[PDB]
Design a protein around this ligand. Structure first.
Ligand code: HEM
Ligand code: HEM
Ligand SMILES: Nc1ccc2ccc(CCNCc3cccc(F)c3)cc2n1
Ligand SMILES: Nc1ccc2ccc(CCNCc3cccc(F)c3)cc2n1
Ligand SMILES: C[C@H](O)[C@H](O)[C@H]1CNc2nc(N)[nH]c(=O)c2N1
Ligand SMILES: C[C@H](O)[C@H](O)[C@H]1CNc2nc(N)[nH]c(=O)c2N1
Ligand SMILES: [Cl-]
Ligand SMILES: [Cl-]
Lengths: 362, 362
């Protein structure tokens, strides 16, 4: 059944891909080559053009993503040539550097060799290339709780964190044939971080909050025409609410709202005072202000929604069906102030696309 | 097919209703009476006990309602005896009075005679018993845009609004046999209104905002055991966000956010300043403060979500499946600060329940 799934997915992808690229006349012959390659080898190899456009289509089909307007400008790096862990490490180092671009973030994806028989060539353990460690023991909570299990796994492998609230996790990945992953400490010269200050409230720096500049998600599987790219880290730039309304605000994350309320000088005693809401707004204002001040790309949820509206309009004009996940598209701050809140979206899964996969730790 | 639908729905309701009331031994005999009544008359008549508990179950099954913890304390008024429009008018007047309760709102439902052959005995045109008129002509927008079509229909019937932003619509309903509805101006002594002031910002009263005290929804159909109560107005108390985040804030409603920003002294020029978010918070703080100050019941979205959590816990303990609409349960202000945002709900329709029905105007 494996092979038929591959062949059926391949036909659908190549057709649609070549239609979009104005290469419709080449479909018939290309499908022939693929069909032979599948019978003879068990799989097929994408051209540079198919891979690039495939990763772009996958972004375009990501139902939960509000930033999809810019799907066609994705920078695709083909690293299907890597064979050694040093090559993987250097490819990951390069991705961080070129995506960061001194603060003017370039949306980028680096694509490593795909699974063969469901056998991974490269297996990346990090959720994001840059992420903070988390610790929990005897009631003592330090760092990012969302990283607790990966942190513990890294410390099994010889690594040790300084146990600040902002320890950078090392890169950690496993090569085909090795039983254990290797880990590499991040060169700090590659990592841009932003200290959180407030435009009007000087005391906000007493919180000593900061966040990293570029979210580089590295544990999702890119699927293109039946081929499973389990290792393909990608990045955009942040929407402010991701940091201010969730990462720093969630009770199961950094849980900073009570401390925010204190430094902005409001009581945190009564629900009817809406102190959490007010604290959320000021923290989110601080996040946008700080990134802007440092010259690191970021977008606010209002602008992002306006861009997404243009994505919707572009889709209808191009004659493509629009898919989306309403529950993820609405921002966690003032959702009813965006157009997204006031319409519905079809949540059907279209491929190419990015998917969750099981964690090798846990 | 009509009759079988009635009989099948009746069996399910009476069984569940009598189980909950500890009257399980009475089901068999009651179903017999009903079955005969249906064959002979084409319908059946609920006991006072069935009607009361039926309306409570219907509230309990309302997927979109965050206030369901208090389902069992609903005050049920049986007005299946009414036959004249004066009786309907006086029943509606009484509902407003007893529900308002001098500000200490009592959740109440008044139940009028049900449809017979799908033929309505009483047909209420108002969306809510107390609601503001809306006008639109030659670019001139006045009042509540959501009331524009009903307002125009009322003005066809001899009524005329003063064209303030807060004209009270008259009660308007039609009796079986009449071709046109009648309308009755609301006695102002029955209507509690709350002027919107801010706890810290004196200039907020320059906006001259106000809202009515009690939301009494009067255009939904109550369905209980196959019986269609198309006329059954009900009320709770407001959650603040309904007024501050939607009614006064939506661009297609009162659209007050730019004026709010001005009186609270912030610029409304840049998305990155998050001025809409800040204006939303202050407006919502003002709404809660004002209602509290006037001694009119209201709940904030944080308290309401905490109550809903207890509803969830109560359901599991009672062995009842929980249903809900995530998209409606999350508040439009700081939704991620509530537990609701972080779990999922089954949106299956369970009866008894309240349903939309077609507008007789439009
Ligand atoms: C260019 C800037 C971008 C912005 C502002 C943006 C914005 C967002 C946001 C806010 C989320 C929700 C994340 C969460 O709540 O955890 C999201 C989800 C997502 N975005 Fe984007 N995005 C961008 C670029 C990209 C790129 C380049 C890709 C991949 C090529 C991508 C694919 C996705 C995917 C797959 C998800 C869902 C992740 C999940 O289900 O956990 N986005 N995006
Ligand atoms: C006791 C105070 C109550 C509170 C605070 C409350 C809260 C809410 C809120 C905030 C909504 C969303 C409304 C919207 O966004 O338009 C809602 C919807 C609803 N509530 Fe409640 N509610 C209460 C009592 C009741 C009662 C007494 C009933 C009926 C017996 C009821 C039935 C419903 C229904 C049917 C909806 C959905 C309306 C629709 O789909 O348009 N609620 N509730
Ligand atoms: N700005 C962007 C762009 C692309 C993105 C793609 C994926 C995600 C998901 C981030 N994962 C959040 C998360 C993952 C695991 C645990 C946890 F608490 C939180 C965010 C993006 N954010
Ligand atoms: N506090 C409560 C309690 C019960 C409720 C039941 C229904 C509704 C729905 C209110 N209808 C909103 C609406 C209806 C029609 C047009 C429009 F713009 C807005 C609100 C409740 N609010
Ligand atoms: C299209 C979407 O379903 C619509 O805007 C809904 C979203 N969630 C909501 N939730 C509540 N409580 N009230 C509403 O009017 C809406 N509107
Ligand atoms: C249970 C629920 O689906 C979950 O909390 C979702 C809701 N919507 C979301 N939306 C975004 N953008 N990010 C999230 O992490 C979530 N969490
Ligand atoms: Cl993140
Ligand atoms: Cl309302």
């Amino acid at each position: 059944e494996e092979k038929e799934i591959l062949w059926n997915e391949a036909k659908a992808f190549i057709a649609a891909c070549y239609q979009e690229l104005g290469k419709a006349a080449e479909v018939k012959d290309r499908l022939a080559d693929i069909k032979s390659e599948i019978d003879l080898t068990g799989s097929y190899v994408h051209t540079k053009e198919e891979l690039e456009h495939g990763a772009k289509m996958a972004w375009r089909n990501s139902n939960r993503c509000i930033g999809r307007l810019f799907w066609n400008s994705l920078n695709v790096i083909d690293r299907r040539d890597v064979r050694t862990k040093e090559e993987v490490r250097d490819a990951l180092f390069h991705h961080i550097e070129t995506a960061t671009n001194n603060g003017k973030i370039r949306p980028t994806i680096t694509i490593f060799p795909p699974e063969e028989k469901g056998e991974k060539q490269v297996e990346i353990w990090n959720h994001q290339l840059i992420r903070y460690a988390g610790y929990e023991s005897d009631g003592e909570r330090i760092g990012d709780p969302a990283s607790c299990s990966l942190t513990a796994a890294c410390e099994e492998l010889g690594w040790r964190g300084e146990r600040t609230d902002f320890d950078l996790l090392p890169l950690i990945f496993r090569m085909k044939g090795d039983e254990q992953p290797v880990w590499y400490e991040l060169p700090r010269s590659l990592v841009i971080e932003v200290p959180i200050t407030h435009p009007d409230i000087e005391a906000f720096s007493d919180l000593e909050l900061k966040w990293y500049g570029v979210p580089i998600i590295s544990d999702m599987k890119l699927e293109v025409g039946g081929i499973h790219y389990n290792a393909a880290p990608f990045n955009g730039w942040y929407m402010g609410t991701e940091i201010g309304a969730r990462n720093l605000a969630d009770e199961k994350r950094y849980d900073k709202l009570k401390k925010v309320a204190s430094v902005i000088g409001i009581a945190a005693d009564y629900n009817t005072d809406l102190w959490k809401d007010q604290a959320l707004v000021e923290l989110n204002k601080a996040v946008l202000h700080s990134y802007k001040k440092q010259g690191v790309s970021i977008v606010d949820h209002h602008t992002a929604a306006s861009q997404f509206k243009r994505f919707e309009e572009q889709a209808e004009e191009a004659g493509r069906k629009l898919t989306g996940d309403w529950t993820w598209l609405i921002p966690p701050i003032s959702p009813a102030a965006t157009h997204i809140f006031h319409r519905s979206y079809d949540n059907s899964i279209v491929k190419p696309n990015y998917f969750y996969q099981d964690k090798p730790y846990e």
